[PDB]
Design an enzyme around this catalytic site. Sequence first.
Site, PDB file in Angstrom:
ATOM      1  N   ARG A  55       1.837   1.873  -3.566  1.00 11.82           N
ATOM      2  CA  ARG A  55       0.728   2.444  -4.343  1.00 11.82           C
ATOM      3  C   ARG A  55       0.524   3.911  -4.006  1.00 11.82           C
ATOM      4  O   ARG A  55       0.260   4.750  -4.882  1.00 11.82           O
ATOM      5  CB  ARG A  55      -0.584   1.699  -4.119  1.00 11.82           C
TER       6      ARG A  55
ATOM      7  N   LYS B 200      -8.753  12.570  -0.806  1.00  9.23           N
ATOM      8  CA  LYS B 200      -7.738  12.599   0.228  1.00  9.23           C
ATOM      9  C   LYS B 200      -7.088  13.967   0.200  1.00  9.23           C
ATOM     10  O   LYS B 200      -6.668  14.416  -0.857  1.00  9.23           O
ATOM     11  CB  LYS B 200      -6.674  11.507  -0.049  1.00  9.23           C
TER      12      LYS B 200
ATOM     13  N   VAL C  92      -4.226  15.470   1.358  1.00  7.52           N
ATOM     14  CA  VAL C  92      -2.794  15.638   1.191  1.00  7.52           C
ATOM     15  C   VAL C  92      -2.172  14.279   0.911  1.00  7.52           C
ATOM     16  O   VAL C  92      -2.515  13.296   1.565  1.00  7.52           O
ATOM     17  CB  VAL C  92      -2.193  16.326   2.376  1.00  7.52           C
ATOM     18  N   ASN C  93      -1.189  14.241   0.039  1.00  4.51           N
ATOM     19  CA  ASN C  93      -0.458  13.001  -0.214  1.00  4.51           C
ATOM     20  C   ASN C  93       0.849  13.337  -0.898  1.00  4.51           C
ATOM     21  O   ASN C  93       0.876  14.171  -1.765  1.00  4.51           O
ATOM     22  CB  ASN C  93      -1.299  12.095  -1.117  1.00  4.51           C
ATOM     23  N   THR C  94       1.913  12.645  -0.495  1.00  5.07           N
ATOM     24  CA  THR C  94       3.211  12.859  -1.096  1.00  5.07           C
ATOM     25  C   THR C  94       3.653  11.655  -1.923  1.00  5.07           C
ATOM     26  O   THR C  94       3.529  10.495  -1.485  1.00  5.07           O
ATOM     27  CB  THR C  94       4.258  13.129   0.007  1.00  5.07           C
TER      28      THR C  94
ATOM     29  N   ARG D 295      -1.778  18.656  -2.702  1.00  9.44           N
ATOM     30  CA  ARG D 295      -2.614  19.248  -1.646  1.00  9.44           C
ATOM     31  C   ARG D 295      -3.900  19.754  -2.289  1.00  9.44           C
ATOM     32  O   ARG D 295      -3.896  20.478  -3.285  1.00  9.44           O
ATOM     33  CB  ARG D 295      -1.845  20.424  -1.021  1.00  9.44           C
TER      34      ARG D 295
ATOM     35  N   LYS E 248       5.097  11.495  13.558  1.00  8.98           N
ATOM     36  CA  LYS E 248       4.008  12.431  13.693  1.00  8.98           C
ATOM     37  C   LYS E 248       2.634  11.718  13.705  1.00  8.98           C
ATOM     38  O   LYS E 248       1.712  12.177  14.397  1.00  8.98           O
ATOM     39  CB  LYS E 248       4.022  13.450  12.586  1.00  8.98           C
TER      40      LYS E 248
ATOM     41  N   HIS F 191       2.521   6.109  -2.391  1.00 11.20           N
ATOM     42  CA  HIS F 191       3.620   7.050  -2.193  1.00 11.20           C
ATOM     43  C   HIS F 191       4.815   6.887  -3.123  1.00 11.20           C
ATOM     44  O   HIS F 191       5.666   7.766  -3.063  1.00 11.20           O
ATOM     45  CB  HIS F 191       4.126   7.027  -0.742  1.00 11.20           C
TER      46      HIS F 191
ATOM     47  N   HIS G  75       4.577   3.705   6.049  1.00 11.37           N
ATOM     48  CA  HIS G  75       3.823   4.946   6.049  1.00 11.37           C
ATOM     49  C   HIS G  75       4.763   6.067   5.617  1.00 11.37           C
ATOM     50  O   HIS G  75       5.948   6.051   5.976  1.00 11.37           O
ATOM     51  CB  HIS G  75       3.160   5.383   7.352  1.00 11.37           C
TER      52      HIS G  75
ATOM     53  N   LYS H 183       0.821  -1.188   0.000  1.00 13.15           N
ATOM     54  CA  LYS H 183       0.000   0.000   0.000  1.00 13.15           C
ATOM     55  C   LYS H 183       0.872   1.262   0.000  1.00 13.15           C
ATOM     56  O   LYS H 183       0.535   2.250  -0.658  1.00 13.15           O
ATOM     57  CB  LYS H 183      -0.984  -0.014   1.167  1.00 13.15           C
TER      58      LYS H 183
END
Length: 124
Positions: free
Chosen positions: A10, A41, A43-45, A85, A66, A12, A119, A7
């Site tokens: 997928r 979603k 925010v995602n990097t 974002r 965090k 990140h 993560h 995951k």
Amino acid sequence: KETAAAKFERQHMDSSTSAASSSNYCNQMMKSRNLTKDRCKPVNTFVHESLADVQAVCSQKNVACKXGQTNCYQSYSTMSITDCRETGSSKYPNCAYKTTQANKHIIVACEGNPYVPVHFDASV
């Protein structure tokens, strides 16, 4: 099904470009990576590096997560990343994103045997 490691890949990893390809990158990728199915979603990097380089971060500088616990690790090198974002006028199912290119130290949470990224925690 997706293991936590799968995951992470997928959500990140995108080793197929050296950086966000254009200003449309997040608009396309948030959709293609199944991050907009049930909600936008916010925010995602994405990380534009080899998976082997990202995996090695799990042996680099240990830092508090965090969110997690303290199973987070900060990369010694900077990495090419894209911050996605959600923009203010977005509303599901029309999910729209600002694409921002960056070169930052990444912080990932790692778990398992083998001990691998699960993560994307932060960048610095």
